[PDB]
Amino acid sequence: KSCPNPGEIRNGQIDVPGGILFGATISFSCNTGYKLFGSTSSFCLISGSSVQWSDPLPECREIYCPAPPQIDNGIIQGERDHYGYRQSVTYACNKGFTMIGEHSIYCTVNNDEGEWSGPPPECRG
């Protein structure tokens, strides 16, 4: 009458408030910077003729900000393919231009979506 030990989710957490016996529900969530790939909860049911979890255990995947904005007359220093939580991008102005504003911005997360911390700098001639 009991389901199998749920185990663990890398970069995440499994909440077990009512045990793992028939009828219990467990809930899943991810550490900051990650988001759930799969079900948000799982229930110990009986199906076929055996007690087992209703959902496969989900995984936690990294949240990425969108590609950093390009700016006129400037370049991004060593731009990467993907930027995750708290990773930064730094800009440089081209020959004959001077930078106004913060030289770097970084990837923030809210509601499982990545967003840049603010606007990129201006390169003025």
From Swiss-Prot:
Disulfide topology: 3-44, 30-60, 65-107, 93-123
Q: Which residues form the Sushi domain?
A: 1-62, 63-125
Instruction: Tell me how the protein is altered or processed after translation.
Output: The Ser/Thr-rich domain is heavily O-glycosylated.
Q: What is the effect of changing residue 67 to P?
A: In Cr(a-) antigen
UniProt feature coiled coil, ranges:
none
Describe, from its UniProt entry, the tissues in which this protein is expressed.
Expressed on the plasma membranes of all cell types that are in intimate contact with plasma complement proteins. It is also found on the surfaces of epithelial cells lining extracellular compartments, and variants of the molecule are present in body fluids and in extracellular matrix.
Similarity remark = Belongs to the receptors of complement activation (RCA) family.
Q: What is known of its domains?
A: The first Sushi domain (SCR1) is not necessary for function. SCR2 and SCR4 provide the proper conformation for the active site on SCR3.
Report the protein's function: This protein recognizes C4b and C3b fragments that condense with cell-surface hydroxyl or amino groups when nascent C4b and C3b are locally generated during C4 and c3 activation. Interaction of daf with cell-associated C4b and C3b polypeptides interferes with their ability to catalyze the conversion of C2 and factor B to enzymatically active C2a and Bb and thereby prevents the formation of C4b2a and C3bBb, the amplification convertases of the complement cascade.
Looking at the record, which disorder is this protein connected with?
Complement hyperactivation, angiopathic thrombosis, and protein-losing enteropathy: An autosomal recessive disease characterized by abdominal pain and diarrhea, primary intestinal lymphangiectasia, edema due to hypoproteinemia, malabsorption, and less frequently, bowel inflammation, recurrent infections, and angiopathic thromboembolic disease. Patients' T lymphocytes show increased complement activation causing surface deposition of complement and the generation of soluble C5a.
Subunit info here reads: Monomer (major form) and non-disulfide-linked, covalent homodimer (minor form). Interacts with ADGRE5. (Microbial infection) Interacts with coxsackievirus A21, coxsackieviruses B1, B3 and B5 capsid proteins.
Protein name (database record): Complement decay-accelerating factor
Task: State the species of origin.
Answer: Homo sapiens
Gene name linked to the record: CD55
